[PDB]
Write a protein that binds this ligand. Structure first.
Ligand SMILES: NC(=O)C1=CN([C@@H]2O[C@H](COP(=O)(O)OP(=O)(O)OC[C@H]3O[C@@H](n4cnc5c(N)ncnc54)[C@H](OP(=O)(O)O)[C@@H]3O)[C@@H](O)[C@H]2O)C=CC1
Ligand SMILES: NC(=O)C1=CN([C@@H]2O[C@H](COP(=O)(O)OP(=O)(O)OC[C@H]3O[C@@H](n4cnc5c(N)ncnc54)[C@H](OP(=O)(O)O)[C@@H]3O)[C@@H](O)[C@H]2O)C=CC1
Ligand SMILES: NC(=O)C1=CN([C@@H]2O[C@H](COP(=O)(O)OP(=O)(O)OC[C@H]3O[C@@H](n4cnc5c(N)ncnc54)[C@H](OP(=O)(O)O)[C@@H]3O)[C@@H](O)[C@H]2O)C=CC1
Ligand SMILES: NC(=O)C1=CN([C@@H]2O[C@H](COP(=O)(O)OP(=O)(O)OC[C@H]3O[C@@H](n4cnc5c(N)ncnc54)[C@H](OP(=O)(O)O)[C@@H]3O)[C@@H](O)[C@H]2O)C=CC1
Ligand SMILES: Cc1c(CN(C)C(=O)/C=C/c2cnc3c(c2)CCC(=O)N3)c2ccccc2n1C
Ligand SMILES: Cc1c(CN(C)C(=O)/C=C/c2cnc3c(c2)CCC(=O)N3)c2ccccc2n1C
Ligand SMILES: Cc1c(CN(C)C(=O)/C=C/c2cnc3c(c2)CCC(=O)N3)c2ccccc2n1C
Ligand SMILES: Cc1c(CN(C)C(=O)/C=C/c2cnc3c(c2)CCC(=O)N3)c2ccccc2n1C
Lengths: 256, 256, 257, 256
């Protein structure tokens, strides 16, 4: 099977609905070994719990608050020490202050802006810099992004700008790391019911809109994202780097 | 194994270097059965011998000149008669008059322009129209495009405009066919030495630019395109339609 | 009137006073340009001839130019050459597809329908640039008009959408060819506007309605807004701009959902 | 004539070769009155001297270090009281630590990253929310971008990611401010020999490349940018917002 005997770091499991958890399962289903990380103590339990559901042999679960330089750096030392070699990292982390995800992007504070950039965009680069030390056989680094990073999506505001910065980081990191045998890609996922969609929008109204209008006439699932993540980490995706695959039932192609 | 139980139509094999022969090989390795179509009688011997290098039952090998509506139609009629159900088509077809592939694009004759449009872009639509009839369980339709459709490539000229037309075509067809359970996607391959590289303005130099400047520091293989085609035909890609995956060693990201 | 003072432009595709080409003709004229008009058919000849006539100064040459017809293309620019010697640019505002293709599924478009739309709506830019090349002696700009449907899927635009992708790639390749001859080539991507080429589209009114309420500028596009950006592209101000597609659509093109 | 009786804030003049100085000339030749900002004494005289060369008479030259919220606010507060109404702002500001404009982008420091983001991207939004306060007749906000925010440019690294973020901000800002009669647009300029090109590796080779491969066969001047800027601030451009106009001799259209 595609990922037999390879080991991957998964970052961003918060709960059962986490896109990261879809990715975890698809990779596990494809025969991967998994390392999870989680942000801060309010979660160790929900991630270990999930990790444990997976058939057989304990997955490492590590703390990694990506705003913290030394725990990020320690996280990957542990990985260097526990396992030696990984074959990729799935970066599934985003955060902005909730107040910034409503009315007028022009009103966002510089602290708001830089917090979003720091956690939603710069973290990929920080992670990629540690990941590099421990991917001596090469492989793929993946991030998740969203269409609001390319075109304007109401209320996505500062996150849109931080997705744009994320997608551009993908390209430049692809240009740095290719020579070291490492391919960097994104998945642009369609809107999905997650911890991170608990907010506003009348989210239901937007899913309904995807259902009526997306080419595939349905909304996307965390398993659809995770199967495209299996492709990207697999050998099938060798010649693919610097790319953004939309797993969104085709919505991204529409105009009016 | 991944495409177990499924049959695909591969159009465009002309010899062992054809990117279509790369896709055929990857699809067979992933358990598919194949039907091959070829441009005209002069190619029949090559295609029958390639097909027969693969283990398993024989493989239909049918003439299909995409310029000839009766031939196109009888071809897929024959396919419905003998197999009943397909799961996908790989369209790997292009042509323009070779004198239009030098000098200035502005000097392209009307006949020249419409011939390139006819064979290089409209054929995807005619193919799709007949494939929709035998795609009884849905599936994927793939074509092959090139960066000249997006950005100016010297001498690519009228093929450049026909690729843009092809890629717009993928969008519109994905929008049509989603609701019939059918996805439509393109692979944008980097340059590869094939028959359609014959006569190009120092292809060797082009190959060197890629090798030294592409994020991955190597040229694209027919096998790399074929493994991405596997993904796109597989159920891994069920959320992915109207997409153009660049398999070009990340070359497409580069500015200057 | 100054800014295009002392320059002459060919405007192709005026069919009545709502034509985008006529918004363009007025702006060019108000910027001091002299104008040559083309038409294709027998009768909307006057229509064009009568619109021309309203323009204040010297009378305008008005010439038949069916872009489907090589001889007529050659004769028209030939006649421009004999009559005025030098022109400074061309506005190409011309599209056609069979009406039955602009509904239903794109996958049912016939071969003839496809090639017809490419011929008139995409190739014709190139045929016109080739003729214009020989009369654009001091350089200048070639324009064309496109639509968002050439970049992303717009319901029912179908075959014209593909023909606009085709048009847009032609702008780039022609820009690459002609720059060394002092000629720039650019597109304006206009918002939906009420013209003859909008007659027969499902729900044109509700299209304009959701432009008004959702586009950043909260209003639909006008012919005059298109013509004023045309003035820029034909003027010296734009001398560093080529192979560009400028969206004059109240900002609509930036929106997802 | 074209900008008769309008006033514009021009930000970023550093010396006579500044793009922002090219824009002030064009705006002035089109009838505008101008207000200038600068950060820090290192160049107060330069901007004063330059502003004084101008043949109308007599421009406010105010301090505005976009890093400083109290100073930004004050600068636009001073403008509120002293001029009244403004019709536009040209934001020609960028900065990143020069140690980050070489080597691999992946080795970029946290605060290197957020510094570039803060000066080169966020400042637009900060400037735009002031300005909003003073553009009571509406008008245009312009920023300068570079192709490296769309595609990978060697060494541009953290600035390319910053420009991507800048360009996304343009889109979101335009969605915010359009309802207030305010347009927001970028100009993507070709390489120009300014202070911000000092130290770029092989800059003369970049220029020679542009001259020989760019469609217009020449390199890009400050006057070309200033004249496109005149268009964007004028009534001619009233239907244009959220646009990025490439003023780069057509270079942006080239593939390989
Ligand atoms: N509709 C959608 O849900 C879409 C989401 N995405 C992207 O998918 C990714 C995953 O989000 P999704 O699964 O939806 O939602 P989740 O909320 O489940 O996942 C987000 C994860 O990011 C983590 N995170 C936040 N801050 C930090 C930090 N300081 N250090 C380390 N980790 C942190 C969260 O941890 P914690 O719980 O501790 O805050 C959580 O585990 C995001 O990048 C998101 O934008 C893309 C397209 C569509
Ligand atoms: N560098 C490269 O090689 C790249 C190629 N591509 C694309 O890959 C695709 C395949 O090209 P490639 O494998 O390289 O070259 P090949 O020439 O081996 O394959 C192209 C196929 O198109 C067929 N074809 C041409 N005209 C017709 C027609 N009238 N009816 C039916 N088939 C026809 C050819 O047949 P015949 O020999 O009889 O003409 C040939 O079998 C093309 O669309 C090409 O543009 C994309 C990116 C890079
Ligand atoms: N919402 C909109 O209306 C938008 C339109 N556009 C584009 O703007 C351009 C102008 O269209 P618009 O003004 O809307 O509609 P009009 O119908 O007013 O203009 C279209 C013109 O194209 C001409 N034409 C068609 N076929 C030929 C041919 N064989 N040879 C010469 N001329 C021909 C028509 O002439 P005739 O009547 O004599 O056949 C007509 O004068 C087109 O390219 C269109 O696609 C772009 C964006 C939005
Ligand atoms: N090749 C090129 O020159 C191109 C440049 N650009 C862009 O054009 C814009 C203008 O750059 P250019 O004219 O070349 O170079 P300049 O160095 O002349 O202008 C850059 C300006 O940004 C100012 N700036 C830096 N930090 C701050 C800050 N803390 N607060 C307020 N102002 C600040 C600089 O001031 P100071 O010197 O005092 O630090 C300087 O005046 C930039 O956005 C740049 O990215 C775009 C495309 C091509
Ligand atoms: C699909 C979608 C999302 C979810 N998404 C794609 C994200 O990237 C969400 C990021 C996010 C980032 N930060 C957050 C939260 C969500 C929630 C609560 C919180 O405190 N901080 C989203 C988020 C905000 C506004 C609109 C949105 N749409 C239309
Ligand atoms: C990579 C590459 C190709 C090959 N390619 C991508 C194609 O799409 C080939 C198209 C093609 C299309 N028509 C053709 C021929 C080739 C050859 C001989 C012929 O008679 N007609 C190419 C083809 C022409 C010009 C430049 C080119 N570059 C840089
Ligand atoms: C804005 C818009 C147009 C107008 N447009 C951009 C066009 O390019 C029109 C092209 C055109 C092309 N060919 C045509 C006609 C119109 C009308 C009558 C005819 O007989 N042939 C349009 C046209 C069809 C479907 C949707 C459409 N939308 C949303
Ligand atoms: C054209 C071009 C530029 C200049 N540019 C477009 C910029 O946006 C420059 C931004 C900048 C940002 N921060 C800077 C400096 C320049 C210079 C000195 C310094 O100390 N900090 C550039 C800058 C670095 C690498 C390549 C570059 N190319 C190819």
């Amino acid at each position: 099977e595609l990922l037999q005997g390879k080991t991957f770091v998964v970052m961003g499991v918060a709960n059962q609905r986490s896109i990261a958890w879809g990715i975890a399962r698809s990779l596990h289903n494809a025969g991967a070994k998994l390392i999870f990380t989680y942000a801060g103590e309010r979660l160790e339990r929900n991630v270990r719990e999930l990790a444990d559901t997976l058939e057989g042999q304990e997955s490492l679960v590590l703390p990694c608050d990506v705003t913290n330089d030394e725990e990020l750096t320690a996280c990957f030392e542990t990985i260097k020490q526990e396992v030696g070699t990984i074959h990729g990292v799935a970066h599934c982390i985003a955060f902005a202050n909730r107040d910034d995800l409503k009315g007028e992007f022009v009103d966002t504070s510089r602290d708001g802006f830089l917090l979003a950039q720091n956690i939603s965009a710069f973290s990929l680069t920080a992670v990629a810099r540690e990941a590099k030390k421990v991917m001596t056989e090469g492989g793929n680094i993946l991030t998740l992004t969203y269409l609001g990073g390319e075109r304007v999506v109401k209320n996505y505001n500062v996150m849109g700008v931080a997705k744009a910065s994320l997608e551009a980081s993908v390209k430049y990191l692809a240009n740095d790391l290719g020579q070291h045998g490492i391919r960097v890609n994104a998945i642009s996922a369609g809107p999905i019911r997650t911890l991170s969609a608990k907010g506003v929008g009348d989210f239901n109204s937007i899913l309904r809109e995807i259902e009526e209008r997306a080419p595939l006439r349905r909304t996307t699932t965390q398993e659809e994202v995770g199967d495209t993540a299996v492709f990207l980490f697999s050998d099938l995706a060798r010649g693919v780097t610097g790319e953004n695959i939309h797993v969104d039932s085709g919505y991204h192609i529409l105009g009016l």
